[PDB]
Structure 1
């Protein structure tokens, strides 16, 4: 196992990335179908190249999002760090 930290190697991160992201798209695709929901993923690498996923119409979702006015779940890496760290392994 590795602990979650910046892959300092260059050929490593560009491989982990290229596959770990397909994972994210997979898990999303699956959740998308199972629970019947719209999803939209957006990934910029360190060199600002775009990679995107959407169960359906990407921009229709990103729009719906801007219009949303109620409060709603909003997580950051910090939120998730402190939800796994408050979870003694």
Structure 2
């Protein structure tokens, strides 16, 4: 097919494409976080919130409280 197209760095107006891009890139960066974490053994935290009010997150042991602790969850919710 046309292969991967060089998308211009800008907000995708087409709701369809925007959402489609989100799911893919969301999964991508999530794996990247996992990889960086395990490979170098460094503490990583990732939080992504979709328009659909979904909060996809990834956190390392010592950083989990940021999203798990009531205190952290509160801050997160406040920011959103």
TM-score band (shorter)? 0.5 to 0.7
SS of equivalent residue, structure 1 residue 16: helix
TM-score (norm 1): 0.59
Unaligned segments of structure 2, at least 5 residues: 1-5, 68-80
**Aligned residue number for residue 49 of structure 2:** 44
Candidates 29, 51, 56, aligned match of 2:34: 29
- Displacement after TM superposition at 1:48 (Å): 3.1
Aligned length: 61
* Counterpart Cα distance in 2 of 1:17 and 1:55: 23
Runs of 4+ in 1 over 4 A off after TM superposition: none
- 1:22-77, CA deviations, whole angstroms, 9 ceiling, x for partnerless residues? 11011111100111012111111224321111233621xx28xxxxxxxxxxxxxx
Matches within 5 A, 1:45-60: 45-56=50-61, 58-59=64-65
* Counterpart Cα distance in 1 of 2:28 and 2:52: 21
- The two structures, once aligned, show a CA RMSD in angstroms of 1.8
Counterpart check, 1:5 vs 2:10: yes
TM-score (norm 2): 0.65
